[PDB]
RNA sequence: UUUGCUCCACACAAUAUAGAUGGAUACGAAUAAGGCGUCCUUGUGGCGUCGCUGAACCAUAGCAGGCUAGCAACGGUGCACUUGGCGGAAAGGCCUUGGGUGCUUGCUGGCGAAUUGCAAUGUCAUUUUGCGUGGGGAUAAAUCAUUUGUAUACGACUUAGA
RNA sequence: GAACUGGCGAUGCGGGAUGAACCGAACGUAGAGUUAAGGUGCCGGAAUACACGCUCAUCAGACACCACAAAAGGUGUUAGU
């Protein structure tokens, strides 16, 4: 339905979002995921830190350089979870994976575009209230990501600029709604209301 | 106007397959808009064209067409089964494809 | 499955030494007539010296609920076999009909004690005609004056894979 | 031969008197009355292609006068019925196309 | 000063609460909750809309902001009488929820000629609104 | 090194396409809470309204969209300019001033369309390269060989030499 | 090391990821339809179906053959006598 779909990753569950997105890429939809530092994983922070340490133990014994690579950024953690669900070793899998780019924060190509959510992977819609969850940025900076604060500063600046945008947009739409209400109850308005618009 | 589309867009998903054996004679098509077999029953018998391009001009055109039709619904989510004169080349998994409104019943 | 209640009346086969046997009757919750008659012969082989080859079934009739739109409280007495022994339990269910009450009973026993249909014996089920004879708190909770409660955290399942606004869980 | 005789009218959208296949049209609910048109003149022999020989090959590169005044006779009787209800001339002049979000299994024509 | 809380009220389930059947055989009609079975299911009745008196899971209905007076366990004659007395059907019809439902089914029932007509009328309305968008 | 190199405009060829066929349509935060409007003493404030999905909103008529006439407004939109800003996370985009020019389906008219013969994607997109024009722009280095020894199995490295 | 039967050996096919023996079913070459055993988040064809409960593990658990865990305990939590 869309050329590129921009997904705001905030408040989403990692596995459910990855299983949605992998099927979208295999069907041929182009997906870009922004704000990867705000993904959520169900479970305690200590459980997921222990899980990452169990993953971090695994390496090739005779040469650590050819072993499993333990990527530390939240976007690369999401990429790992998604590459697990795409059959990446085939040409179809590579062609699917080149339709995806995942970012921490919202870069300047995508800060002026529209962000969507996936309601079947949202934490507030999936988890029972009371279950504990993690933040992927906190877990990733606990296991070695170096750029948690610069992303926070850039996101603060971007949010200031976006609020400055939204004030003007709200004023303009209030003018347009006022003019539409005053130009209603004419004959064309009543004919459109009879016809359903 | 600015739009001239008289077909419905669809995606070529895969072949008919088991877990480890595929069957290229039957293709699986996701028609956009339909999400149930009862709505997919409208599209049975409709013609499908896969339209692609080539470098070498054959009979006045560089655009080649592969024709087929919808035969039955597949699953619970509005995917349909489609058969073509020559089977789809399997590099078109995820490629766009056209479902025409003829032969019409309305 | 979705249960129905039947009366099954049967007897022994008549002999010359004793014609007209005593016509025993039982109430069975079962999915259909075949399972109902099988459970009838199962419990009569547990009770009297008879079996299906030596007896016959004179009647089977479905008993549907007399007031299927009255909300009742039922007390149910049950035998079940655990992994180590056999126990008796009494559970009480607030529900609108007997067959639905025993359906939720079978689900409740399978959920909370891992007891299967082959292990559960239904001793009896009876409507509690008076309040304050209700003895369980989980059903006595719903018998208070002007009962009302909210439903927090509404989750609306979507048809599209993409949503264009952040959803709200107000109800 | 199981075909439908149709016309534009030719003054409205430039579609002449023609025959089409019934499986390649959509019957909309919009109805006009065509009583007062003498269509019994047209038949299967009225449309003949005058088939071409195999020798005549078009290397690089007209209309029947009987066909053009037959069209002019019928369309002036159709447009008088068109002028009764408003916006039909504009509706017949405009083309049909599917927009984004149009589901033909839900659309009523 | 005085103490301030955010109240955060929402749509209690009790007797006399009007609900809209979301899915099933009724699927879009109104009913009134007659009694509460347990936490997850209630006994409802919809006698004006033709909904039979039944027990139903609370996930198959949507609670509306409408309430009227009933005693608990009321039979369908009393339910219909109190429904007509409180006159909640046009009170539902006056809401923007029901107007949205009616708009959706009207747009579904439009034909191609009517779609052409609304396109022409929307062009005329857009002309006069964008003309109004030049003085303020 | 016989007129080479780069950029700009179109002119023709070739080359392919992981797959245009109306529009990726921009707050943030919370979810046992919010959004919008309005008012005030500007707050963890009062009042009203909305949600219950984008089934939306915008756009959408004309030879794949022609040639003309008029009315009403002083709007809407495209193109090449032009003034002023803002944007460095991967800015390469967003906003704005002024005039020009084209269209206007906001409303009413006049002419054209056939024959692709009862359908045949019935061809309208963008990706790279070459060769021509005619209009600008600029006039280098690296390697081998010689040499060095802070280096060295050989390659490699570090030096020097108009 | 024996008894009865069914198999593998001599046998491919669908399932159990993988495997001689397990489950289903035995095989000419093709087309259409329906299924078995097994499954339907993604890999992966098929409901992020519906319904009632239970469980939060600083080594959870996830399916017969089958790829292990016991005695003894716990105002963890649930249901009972």
DSSP string over C82-96 = -SS-EEEEEEEEEES
Tokens of A101: 């780019």
**Among candidate residues A121, A123, A147, the one with its CA nearest the CA of residue A134:** A123
Chain B: touching chains (3 or more CB pairs < 8 Å): A, D
Which structure tokens are listed for A110? 């995508």
Q: CA A118 to CA B23: how far, in whole Å?
A: 33
Is E43 in contact with E54 (CB distance < 8 Å)? Answer: yes
Whether the CA torsion C117, C121, C123, C128 is positive or negative: it is: negative
Q: At what angle do helices A136-143 and A45-56 cross, to 10 degrees?
A: 40
CA of A150 to C1' of F120 (A): 60
Beta strands in chain B (DSSP E): 7-17, 22-31, 47-53, 63-74, 79-84, 96-100
Alpha carbons E45 and E16: distance in angstroms, whole number: 10
Q: Is C137 on the interface with A (CB under 8 A)?
A: no
Nearest-CA neighbor of C163 among A125, A166, E58? A125
Residue A23 vs residues A27, A86, A97, B76, D61: alpha-carbon distances, Å: 6, 8, 11, 17, 52
| Cβ atoms within 10 Å, residue C21 | 16
| Residue E133 contacts A, CB cutoff 8 Å | yes
Question: Considering only CB atoms, which chain B residues are within 8 Å of A28?
Answer: 11, 93-96
CATH of the domain at B42: 2.40.10.190
- Give the distance, in angstroms, between residue E45 CA and nucleotide G50 C1': 23
Rounded distance between C-alpha atoms, residue B92 and residue B14, angstroms: 9
Q: Distance from first CA to last CA of chain E, Å, rounded?
A: 42
Nearest Cα of chain C lies from the Cα of E136 at a distance, in angstroms, of 31
**Does strand F come within 7 Å of the CB of B38?**
no
**Strand pairing report for A4-8 and A30-34:** parallel
Instruction: List chains adjacent to chain A, taking adjacency as at least 3 C-beta pairs closer than 8 Å.
Output: B, C, E
Task: Assess contact for B42 and B84: CB atoms under 8 A.
Answer: no
What does chain E look like in DSSP terms, one character per residue? ------------B-TTEEEEE-SSSS-S-EEEEEEE-SSSEEEEEETTTTEEEEEEEGGGEEEEEEE----TT--HHHHHHHHHHHTHHHHHHTSHHHHHHHHHHHHHH--HHHHHHHHHHHHHHHHHHHHHTT--
Give me the B residues in range 74-93 that sit within 7 A (CB) of strand G. 74-77, 79, 81, 83
Q: What length is written for chain C?
A: 171
What 3-state DSSP class applies to C122?
strand
With beta carbons under 8 A apart, name residues in chain B contacting D105.
33-34, 39, 42-43
Residue with tokens 């004879």: C133
Looking up tokens 């067409």, which residue turns up? B65
E109: its two tokens: 């029932």
- The whole-angstrom separation of Cα B90 and Cα B94 is 9
Distances (CA, A) of B57 to A143, B50, B66, D58: 58, 18, 16, 19
Q: Which residues in window 144-163 of C are less than 7 A from strand F by Cβ?
A: 152-154, 156, 158, 160, 163
Residue E11 Cβ under 7 A from any strand F atom: no
Tell me which residue in C152, C153, C163 faces A119 most closely, judged by beta carbons: C163
Residue with tokens 């618009």: A197
Strand, helix or coil for residue C169 = coil
Cβ contact A94 with chain G strand, < 7 A: no
Q: Which of D2, D44, D9, D4 is nearest to D27 (CA)?
A: D4
Q: Is the CB of residue B47 less than 8 Å from the CB of residue B102?
A: yes
**How far apart are the C-alpha atoms of B92 and C85, rounded to whole Å?**
62
Domains of chain C, residue spans: 2-68, 69-145
The pair of structure tokens assigned to E125 is 């309305």
CB of E108 within 8 Å of a chain D CB? The answer is yes
Taking the CA of residue E93 and the nearest CA in chain D, the distance in Å comes to 25
Query: Does domain A148-197 bear CATH number 1.20.5.4280?
Result: yes
- Is residue D84 less than 8 Å (CB to CB) from chain E? no
Does nucleic acid strand G have an atom less than 7 angstroms from the CB of E36? no
Asked whether the beta carbons of residue D98 and residue B33 sit closer than 8 angstroms, the reply is no
Please give the Cα distance from E84 to C167 (Å, whole number).
Answer: 36
Whether the CB-CB separation of D109 and D29 falls below 8 Å is answered with yes
Q: How far is the CA of A159 from the C1' of F29 (A)?
A: 11
Residue nearest to nucleotide F122 (CA to C1'): B61
DSSP D55: S
Q: How far apart are CA B40 and CA E109, in angstroms?
A: 20
A21 touches strand G (CB under 7 A): no
Sign of the C-alpha dihedral, residues A131, A136, A141, A144? positive
| CATH architecture for segment(s) C2-68 | Roll (3.10)
Contact E41, E57 (CB under 8 A): yes
Domain count, chain B: 1
Contact present, C27 and C6 (Cβ < 8 Å): yes
Decide if domain A1-147 falls under CATH 1.10.287.180. Answer: no
Give A21's contacts (C-beta < 8 A, 6+ positions apart).
Answer: A7, A31, A33, A82, A100
Q: Name the phi and psi angles at C124, rounded to 5.
A: -155, 160
**Nearest nucleotide over every DNA/RNA strand to the A4 CA, judged by C1':** F24
Which has the closest alpha carbon to A196: E115, C54, E63, B103? E115
Strand partners, D5: D19
Tell me if C149 and E43 make a contact (CB, 8 A cut-off).
no
- Between C94, C146, C148, which is nearest E13 by CB? C148
Give distance CA E44 / C1' F42 (Å).
48
A25 touches A97 (CB < 8 A): yes
Nearest-angstrom CA–CA distance, E105 and C163: 22
Interface test with A, best of C161, C168, C170 (most A CBs within 10 A): C161
3-state helix/strand/coil string of chain A: CCCEEEEECCCEEHHHHHHHHHHHHHHCCEEEEECHHHCEEECCHHHHHHHHHHHHCCCCCCCHHHCCCCCCCHHHHHHHHHHCCCCCCCHHHHHHHCCEEECCCCCCCCCCCCCEECCCCEHHHHCCECECEEEHHHHHHHHCCCCHHHHHHHHHHHHHHHHHHHHHHHHHHHHHHHHHHHCCCCHHHHHHHHCCC
CB contact under 8 A, E111 and D30: yes
Options 3.30.1490.100, 3.40.50.300, 3.10.20.10, 3.90.79.10; which CATH number does C69-145 get? 3.10.20.10
Find out whether C40 and C66 touch, Cβ atoms under 8 Å. Answer: no
E102 to chain D, closest Cα gap in Å: 16
- C37: which 2 tokens? 């008659």
Dist. CA E33–CA C42, nearest whole Å? 42
A26: closest CA of chain B, how far (Å): 7
Residues in chain A: 197
Task: Domain ranges for chain A, please list them.
Answer: 1-147, 148-197
Q: Which residues are C78's β-sheet partners?
A: C89, C122
Common-topology check for domains A1-147 and A148-197: no
Strand G at less than 7 A from CB of A47: yes
Task: Judge whether C164 is closer than 8 Å to chain A, CB to CB.
Answer: yes
Q: Is E14 in Cβ contact with C148 (below 8 Å)?
A: yes
DSSP tag of D24: G
Tell me the C-alpha to C-alpha distance, in Å, between residue C37 and each of C27, C51, C120. Answer: 10, 12, 17
Domain ranges, residue E19 = 12-94
Chain G nucleotides near the protein (CB, 7 A): 13-16, 31-33, 41-54, 56-58, 60, 78-81
At residue C81, the 3 state secondary structure works out as: strand
Q: Which nucleotides of F are covered by protein (CB under 7 A)?
A: 14-34, 36-38, 44-46, 49-65, 73-76, 87-94, 105-107, 111-115, 117-125
Q: How far is the CA of D14 from the C1' of F111 (A)?
A: 12
Residues 6+ apart with CB under 8 A from C81: C115, C119
Phi-psi region of A36 (alpha: psi -120 to 50; beta: other; left: phi over 0): alpha
**B50 touches B87 (CB < 8 A):** no
Q: Is the CB of A197 under 7 A from strand F?
A: yes
How far is it, in rounded angstroms, from Cα C127 to Cα A163?
63
Measure CA A134 to chain center.
15
Give C30's DSSP letter: E
Q: How many helices (H) and strands (E) does chain B have?
A: 1, 6
d(CA B85, CA B80): 17
Q: Which residue of E has its CA nearest to A190?
A: E121
Are B29 and B8 within 8 A, CB to CB? no
Is the preceding omega at residue D9 within 30 degrees of 0, hence cis? yes
Q: Name, in order, each residue with C-beta under 8 angstroms of E103's C-beta and a sequence gap of 6 or more.
A: A196
| Residue that has been written with the tokens 């300047």 in this structure | A108
Structure tokens at C82: 């655990």
- Cβ-in-10-Å burial (0-12, 13-18, 19+) of A78 comes to buried
Q: Which residues in chain A have their CB less than 8 angstroms from residue C159's CB?
A: none
Could E13 and C151 be called an inter-chain contact, meaning their C-beta atoms sit closer than 8 Å? yes
Residue B93, domain extent:
1-106
- The closest alpha carbon to A35, from A5, A71, A8, A4, belongs to A8
Residue A114 contacts C where some CB pair is shorter than 8 Å: yes
Rounded distance between C-alpha atoms, residue A93 and residue A83, angstroms? 9
Q: Which residues contact B26 (CB under 8 A, 6 or more apart)?
A: B15, B16, B71, B81, B82, B83
Cβ within 8 Å, pair A124-C158: no
Paired residues of A37 in beta bridges: none
């Amino acid at each position: 339905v869309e050329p590129v779909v921009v997904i705001d990753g905030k408040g989403h569950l990692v596995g459910r979002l990855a299983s949605v997105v992998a099927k979208q890429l295999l069907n041929g939809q182009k997906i870009v995921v922004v704000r990867a530092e705000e993904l959520n994983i169900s479970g305690e922070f200590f459980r997921n830190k222990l899980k990452y340490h169990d993953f971090l133990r695994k390496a090739t014994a005779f040469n650590k350089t050819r072993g499993p690579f333990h990527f530390r950024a939240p976007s690369r953690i999401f990429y790992k979870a998604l590459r697990g669900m795409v059959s990446h070793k085939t040409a179809r899998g590579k062609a699917a994976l080149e339709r995806l780019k995942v970012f921490e924060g919202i870069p300047p190509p995508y800060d002026k575009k529209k962000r969507v959510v996936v309601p079947q992977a949202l934490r507030v819609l999936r988890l029972k209230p009371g279950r504990k969850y993690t933040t992927l940025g906190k877990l990733s900076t606990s296991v070695g990501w170096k750029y948690e604060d610069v992303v926070a500063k850039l996101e603060a600046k971007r949010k200031v600029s976006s609020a400055e945008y939204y004030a003007k947009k709200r004023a303009f739409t209030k003018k347009v709604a006022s003019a539409n209400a005053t130009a209603a109850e004419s004959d064309v308005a009543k004919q459109l209301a009879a016809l359903g618009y | 106007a600015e739009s001239h589309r008289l077909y419905v867009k669809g995606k070529h998903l895969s072949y008919q397959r088991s877990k480890r054996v595929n069957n290229p004679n039957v293709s699986l098509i996701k028609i956009e808009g339909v999400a149930t077999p009862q709505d997919a029953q409208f599209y049975l018998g409709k013609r499908i064209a896969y339209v692609y391009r080539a470098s070498k001009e054959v009979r006045g055109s560089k655009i080649r067409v592969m024709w087929g039709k919808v035969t039955r619904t597949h699953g619970n989510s509005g995917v349909v089964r489609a058969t073509f004169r020559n089977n789809l080349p399997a590099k078109t998994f995820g490629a766009s494809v056209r479902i025409f409104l003829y032969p019409s019943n309305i | 499955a979705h249960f129905k209640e039947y009366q099954v009346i049967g007897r022994r086969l008549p002999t010359e030494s004793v014609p007209e046997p005593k016509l025993f009757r039982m109430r069975i919750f079962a999915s259909n007539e075949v399972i109902a008659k099988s459970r009838y012969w199962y419990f009569l082989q547990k009770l009297h010296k008879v079996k299906k080859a030596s007896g016959e079934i004179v009647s089977i009739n479905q008993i549907n609920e007399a007031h299927p739109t009255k909300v009742k409280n039922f007390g149910v007495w049950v035998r079940y076999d655990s992994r180590s022994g056999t126990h008796n339990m009494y559970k009480e269910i607030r529900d609108v009909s007997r067959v639905a009450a025993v359906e939720t009973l079978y689900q409740d026993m399978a959920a909370r004690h891992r007891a299967r249909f082959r292990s559960i014996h239904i001793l009896k089920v009876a409507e509690i005609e008076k309040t304050a004879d209700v003895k369980r708190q989980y059903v006595k909770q719903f018998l208070t004056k002007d009962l009302k409660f909210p439903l927090p955290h509404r989750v609306q399942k979507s048809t599209k894979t993409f949503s264009y606004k952040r959803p709200s869980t107000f109800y | 031969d199981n075909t439908l005789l149709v016309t534009g009218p030719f003054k409205v959208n430039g579609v002449p008197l023609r025959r089409v296949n019934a499986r390649y049209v959509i019957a909309t609910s919009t109805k006009v009355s065509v009583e007062g048109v003498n269509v019994e003149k047209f038949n299967v022999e009225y449309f003949a292609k005058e088939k071409l020989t195999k020798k005549e090959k078009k290397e690089a590169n007209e209309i029947k006068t009987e066909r053009v005044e037959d069209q002019k006779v019928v369309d002036k009787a159709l447009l008088a019925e068109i002028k009764k209800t408003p916006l039909l001339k504009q509706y017949l002049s405009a083309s049909f196309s599917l927009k984004n979000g149009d589901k033909p299994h839900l659309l009523k024509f | 000063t005085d103490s301030i809380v955010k109240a955060s009220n929402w749509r209690l389930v009790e007797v006399g609460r009007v609900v809209l059947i979301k899915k099933g055989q009724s699927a879009g009609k109104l009913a009134a909750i007659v009694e509460i079975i347990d936490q997850k299911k209630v006994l409802i009745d919809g006698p004006k809309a033709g909904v039979p008196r039944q027990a139903i899971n609370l996930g198959q209905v949507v609670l509306t902001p409408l309430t009227f007076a009933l005693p608990r366990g009321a039979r369908t004659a009393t339910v219909s009488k109190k429904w007509a007395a409180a006159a909640v059907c046009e009170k539902w019809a006056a809401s923007s929820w029901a107007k949205k439902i009616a708009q959706r089914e009207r747009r579904a029932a439009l034909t191609d000629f009517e779609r052409f007509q609304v396109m022409v009328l929307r062009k005329q309305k857009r002309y006069t609104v964008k003309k109004a968008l030049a003085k303020a």
